[PDB]
Design a binder for this molecule. Structure first.
Ligand code: EBP
Ligand code: EBP
Ligand code: EBP
Ligand code: EBP
Ligand code: ZN
Ligand code: ZN
Ligand code: ZN
Ligand code: ZN
Lengths: 329, 329
């Protein structure tokens, strides 16, 4: 019935056009509060974010899912502020990414489950703001720790009905191992979105997951270091496949009958301390549309390639609504 | 002239008996805020801490230096609250330990220097509380990143006059490489304390460093898992050397004429999330005296072994004052 946002619960119908994998800021736990000047200032950053969100809003975006976990330096107070100023719904996450500190690395599956439930049921920190999704990550073969995270995510999910979204090394088929883990915990594929999937040209890997019930996240659309190879760092991060190629995978899946299984996003951000210094400069150069990239460039592009408008609407309105709706077994 | 505490600046005379390496809590950045229940509750942790500090105060302790860095999950507001409540001065730290997140790992020596200076000159977070010491660490041969940390700690020390205290793997003779880098930076040894030095029986290593003008940190006196060989975990952490063995190193150094270079502490804490679950329990059992261990147990012991009281007062009062006083080259 309802989805938890940083401003409270909204009904399914209020979500509207939703971007399923984004970030206000990409950082580290405690970083933004200890070194705000790294981003110029906290004020500078929030302003940037608001402007960005207002632009996406103007394009039709009504809601975003900020998948920043505790180790991504998620700051729920920053999220609540910009959500209110931009008037954009923001769904917060719980979960763990790949940079956990010792206090986390040393926990058991049982403890991690506990923490995930806390974030979801009780709320984040002392705010009362409840997470609406669980984020997990692997990057090639899962580490023993990661496996734990995966199980914990599954259990928390099984208890709450809240979906799970993942970060993968697409080219390594991480999705496959993740699914194996989730299934072993009894998790239903329809509550899982395997992300960064557009990062591979292997349609057969994607179609096999789709077939099993999983949701496929085509969220690195605008990531391309095309014409920037003069920059190793940018190249390494964004890759060299064009945005059109990535977009085409969306059509490719539609064509195979998996439209109900597709979720699309930008995986964008307004600040990024967890990478090389000044990386944002490069990014804002690569995609000046920011999070408005999807509605502004991708929707028209697919339309133009023959995708029916109704179909696009299902993908950006319907799929997300279903995904996000907390659903128990 | 004055030393920075979490309650403000105090005069050197005001510091009295000082504990140079301690912690209110051993954790991770953001952890305390995110999962306070891991310590029962923030209030519980705070109460435990006040009691513990009141007892040390009762034994003569006027000031403690909490060497918890950003990566240790230092919570200055927490430090401030128990400091006020227990009526004990607390000196806060800047620097980095060995669990830095990606947002730090990726910084340059120049950016790191700036962060350090920030904490010292402007304040920690937004509290206006200024760090009174710089904490760095190695765990055997320094890593590239650790080398950077050491240079930055050096540089910030040079500009502000604040001392540097370190975490070593004494067994490995880390002190030697530490000194090497500091010296390569023009840093006076007299502004450095090589910690956890009681962790080794190598008097050759010790006297060398002392001979050189470095301060020797004998802060693991109470760490011993004797009678706990049953516990792999506590054994690993604590060692199997008795407290007496460690305590005697203090006598040895005095004996060689190095009384003015010794600094003693307990390296105690009231909370510890960065280790196995329930470890505190084990610790409380091993040393019920907590931070009062030194005055209650070590002082009299050394007395009984022949050390002049007057000498013991130099070690606990004079040495620290001198080390802590901001001193420029
Ligand atoms: C915050 C998570 O970052 P990520 O997993 C993915 C990521 C890469 C590039 C851009 C523009 C956004 C997000 O990679 C950082 C090393
Ligand atoms: C944070 C401590 O709360 P708790 O133990 C139980 C708890 C859940 C929900 C609400 C509204 C209050 C308390 O967390 C759930 C795992
Ligand atoms: C927080 C710093 O702890 P440390 O560096 C060393 C340490 C060990 C034991 C005790 C009682 C205190 C401190 O522990 C590594 C996990
Ligand atoms: C905004 C953070 O302050 P700043 O850039 C300069 C600064 C230092 C000290 C005081 C009292 C005010 C301002 O930090 C120094 C490294
Ligand atoms: Zn990701
Ligand atoms: Zn992401
Ligand atoms: Zn240490
Ligand atoms: Zn310590």
């Amino acid at each position: 019935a309802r989805i938890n946002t940083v401003r409270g619960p909204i009904t399914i119908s209020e979500a509207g056009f939703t971007l399923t994998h984004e970030h206000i800021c990409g950082s580290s736990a405690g970083f933004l509060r200890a070194w705000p000047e790294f981003f110029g200032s906290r004020k500078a950053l929030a302003e940037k974010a608001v402007r960005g969100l207002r632009r996406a809003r103007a394009a039709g975006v009504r809601t975003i899912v900020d998948v920043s976990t505790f180790d991504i330096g998620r700051d729920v107070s920053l999220l609540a502020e910009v959500s209110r100023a931009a008037d954009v719904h923001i769904v917060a996450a719980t979960g763990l990414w790949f940079d956990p500190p010792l206090s986390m690395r040393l926990r058991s599956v049982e403890e991690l489950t506990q923490f995930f439930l806390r974030e979801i049921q009780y709320g984040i920190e002392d705010t009362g703001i409840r997470a609406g999704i669980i984020k997990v990550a692997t990057t090639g073969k899962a580490t023993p720790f990661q496996e734990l995270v995966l199980k914990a995510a599954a259990r928390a999910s099984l208890a709450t009905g809240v979906p799970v979204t993942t970060h993968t090394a697409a080219s390594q088929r991480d999705g496959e191992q993740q699914a194996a883990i989730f299934e072993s915990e009894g998790l239903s594929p329809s509550r899982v979105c395997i992300g960064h999937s557009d990062d591979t040209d292997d349609l057969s890997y994607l179609t096999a997951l789709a077939a099993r019930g999983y949701l496929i996240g085509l969220d690195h659309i605008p990531h391309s270091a095309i014409g920037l190879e003069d920059n190793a760092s940018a190249s390494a991060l964004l890759g060299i496949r064009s945005w059109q190629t990535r977009a085409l995978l969306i059509k490719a899946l539609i064509d195979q009958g998996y439209m109900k299984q597709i979720l699309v996003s930008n995986d964008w951000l307004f600040g990024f301390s967890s990478y090389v210094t000044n990386i944002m400069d490069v990014m804002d150069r690569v995609n000046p549309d920011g999070m408005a990239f999807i509605p502004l460039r991708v929707i028209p592009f697919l339309r133009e390639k023959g995708v029916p408008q109704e179909t696009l609407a299902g993908i950006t309105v319907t799929n997300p609504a279903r995904f996000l709706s907390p659903t128990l077994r």
